[PDB]
Amino acid sequence: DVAKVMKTLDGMREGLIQTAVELGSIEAPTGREGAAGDYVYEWMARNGFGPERVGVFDDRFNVVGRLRGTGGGASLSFNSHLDTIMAREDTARFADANDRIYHEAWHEEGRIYGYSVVNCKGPMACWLIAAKALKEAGAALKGDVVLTAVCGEIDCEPVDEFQGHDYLAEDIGARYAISHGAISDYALVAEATNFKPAWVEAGKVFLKVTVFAGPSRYTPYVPRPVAALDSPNAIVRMAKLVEALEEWADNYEKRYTREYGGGTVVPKVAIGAIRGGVPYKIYRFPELCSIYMDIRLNPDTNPLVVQREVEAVVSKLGLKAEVKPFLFRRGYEAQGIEPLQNALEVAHREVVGRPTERPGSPECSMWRDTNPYNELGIPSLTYGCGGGAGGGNTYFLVDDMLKAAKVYAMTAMDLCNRTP
Template sequence: MPFQIVKQALPGLRRAPLVDLSPALSRIEAEEVIDLALALGNIDSPTGAEGAAAEYVFDWLTEQGLSPRRHALVADRFSVSAAIEGRGGGYGLILNGHLDTTLRPDAVWSAKDPLDRLYRGAWLEDDLIVGDGVVNDKGPVAACLVAAKAIHQSGIELPGDIIVTAVAGEIGREPVDEFEGTDYLSKDLGTRFMVTHGVVADFALVAEGTGFGIVWAEPGMSIFKVTVFSDGPRYYTPYLPDRGALADAPNAIVRAAAVIAAFEDWASGYQTRFREDRAGGRIVPKASVNAIRSGYPYEPTSAPQVASFYVDTYLPPAANPIDVREELRAVLRTAGVNGRVDLIVYRPGFEAVGVDRLVDTISRHHRARFGQDPAVVGPEVSSMWRDTNAFIELGIPAVSYAPRAASHASRKAIRAQDLVDAAHVYAAVAIDIASQRREPWAPLGSHLNALSDRADLTAGNSGTRVTQVTPA
C-alpha cells in the first residue's frame, strides 16, 4: 500500500514540529460539514454552468473572515481560492476540489432521465448524503472549506501558506466539430488556469474520492474521432442491395458497427498490455466508444455515407497518443473499412515525484483519525484523469485523497461521517505541512528539472551560481 512504499523509501523522513492541533480541530462541527455539503449539492452546477456554486463558495468564505479571490478565464465560470498566509519559511499546501457536476439537464442522449433528482440535488438518507454532485465532488469540497475555516478561526500561526480552492471545469468537456468555444471548455479553465494565475504552493491535496486511499499516479487522456466512409451511393432505402458482411454495407452506420466490434477486441487487449503497477497507484488504461453520430433523425430515408464515433482512451504516463492513433488506424484495416482517425484531445498523465513528505503526513494523520493505514485503492480509482495531473504538470507534487463509497459506480451516495472525518484529516495535514520548515529556493518537487536544478538554485541563493554556456 502507499504508506508502506513511502516508509521503505524514506525511513528517516523528518517529522513535523509538534503543533497543537486541538484549537483548529475542536472547531470542526459535523453539522456544519453536512449542511454545507447539502447546500452545495442542491446548487445545480453541471460543467459549463458552475457560476452559482462558485458565488456561493465565494460568499461563504467571505462570511468566515477569509479573503477569497476569483480566477476566471470566463467571467461566469470562475474558480475560487482563499489563502491563510503564513509568516514565511514553511511549506505551502493547496486543498483542492471541484464544483462542476457530471450531467447537464439537457443531456437526453447520455442519461435516460437527466432531470433525475440524483443528478440535480442532494439529501440525507439515514447516515448517507445522496446525490451525484455531493459524491463528485462537493462533499469533499465542503470538508476542505470547513477545515480551512477552522484553521483560520483558531488563530494558529504557521510558517507556510494554506490555500483552499474550489474550481470549475474538472469534469471532461471538450470542443469538437461544431461544438466550439468556451462553453465547451473544462480542464483548461479550472485548476490549471488557477495555478498559472497565481495559486501556487509546494504541495496539493486533491480532495477527490479514493476511499481514503492515497493516489499520486494517474493516466493521461486522449480522445479520438473515428470516421467511417461508405464506398457506395447514398441509397434510398427501397434501392438497398441485398445484405452481406457488415464491413461491406453501403450504409456507414452499419460499417461503423463492424469497426466498433473490432475496436472492442482492441480495447480489451490495450488495457491488458499497458497495465502498470506504480508506487502511486495501479493504472489500467481503458478505452470506450462514448458518442456516435451519423445521418439525420428527421430525414431517415437514405443510407448515410459518413459515420463518426468518439473514443475516450486513457494513456499510461509518458505514452505518446500518436501511437494510439496508429493502433486505431490498424483497427480500421482489421475491420476492412475505409475511414480516418483524428486526435482531438490530449492531456498527459503523471506520477508525482517529490511527494513523499505529503504522503507521509497524510498517512500519519489518517492513522491518528482511523487507527489504521490508508486504504489500498482499486485500479479504477487510480486509472482516471483528475486535477492531480494538472498540478503535477506544473511542477506541484499532488495526491488525491478523499472518502468514497464502496458502491460509487452504481450508488451515488457518501457517508456523512466520512466527510466529517475528512475535514479533520485535511485540517491536521494542512497545519502539519505548513509547520514544516521549507529550505529557501527549494524547487517545486514535481517539476521536470527539479533534481537537476536544485543545486544551481541553492547556489544562486548564496550568490555563487554559475551558468555554463556551451560554445557554438
C-alpha cells in the same frame, strides 16, 4: 494544538452538512459552474479567506482564497471542483435523466445523498470547513493554506461544431488557476478515493473515428443483399468496426496496465458517442458515420502510438476511415511527494486508525486535477472519503466526511510548519 482543532471540527459538523447540501443543491453541471463558484466565493469571503475569481469567462471561473500564515513555511494547496457530471436534462446518456439523485442533495440519515455531493461538493465541503476550523481555532501555521475551487474538472471537451464557452472544461479549469497564481509548495486534491491516497493518474486521448462508405441512395434503390463490411450504408460498416474496437479495447487495458509508486494504472477504453446521418432526413442512408472514443493513457504511453493501433484495427477490416484525435492530455506520477505523503499518512493513522492502503486501480486511472499540479512541479496526491462517483457511489457518511476534515486539518498543521 491538534486536539484544539479536532474539538472545533465537532463544533461545525452541522455546518459541514449544511455546506454540502447547500452546495450540492446548486445546479452546476459543467458549463454552468458559475452559480456554484459564486456560492463558494461568498462563503470564502464571509469567512475571511479573501477570495479571488480566476477564470477565462465571467460565469465560469475558479475561486482562489487563502489562509495566510505567519511566514517562512511551506504552503499547502487544497483543491476540489465546482462542476458536477449530469445536467438537468441529459436524456442522451441516462435512461432516467430525472432521478432525484442526479440533480439534488439531501441529508436522509447519517449519510448525504447526491451525485453532486460525491462529485464533488462533499470533499470541497470537507476542506472548506477544515480551513474554517484552523482559522477559528487560531492554529499555528508558518505557511499559507491555499483554497482553490475550480471549474471544468470533468472531461467535457469541445469537438467538431461544439466549440467555445459551453464545451470547454479543463483548459479553463484548474490548470488555468495554477498558471495564474494559485501556486503552492504542495497540493492535495480532495475527491472520493475511499480514504486511500494516490499520486498517479492517467492521461487520455480522444479519437474521432469516421468511416466512409457509399454511394448514397434513396431507400427504394438501396442494393441488397450485401455483406456488412461491403455495405453502402456507413452505419452498417460502423457496426462491424465497433465490435472489432471493443475486442481491441478489452486487450488494451491488459497490455498497458502499469504499476507505479502512486498506484497501479489500468487504462480503459470506451466508445462514448456515435452519430451518422441526421434524424430529420433519413430517406438517404449516410455515406459516413462517426464514433467518439475515450482512451485513457498511463503516464508513459504516447498518444501517437494508440492512434496507429486503432488505425490498424480499421485497416485489418479493410475499412477506409479517418482516425483523428481531438483531445490529448498527459497523466503524471508525483515526484517529491514524500513530505505530503507522510504528512497525510500521520494524520490518517491518527483519525482513521490504521495505515493507508493502495488505491483502487480506477482511482489511479482517471483524470484528477493532480495532473495539472504535477505537470507544473507541485507535488500532488488525492485523498478523500467515500467511493468514486464513476463507480458510482451515491452517498457520503457524515462521519467519514468529518474524519476527512480532520485529516485535512492535521495534514495542514503538519506540512505548513515545515520549511522548504
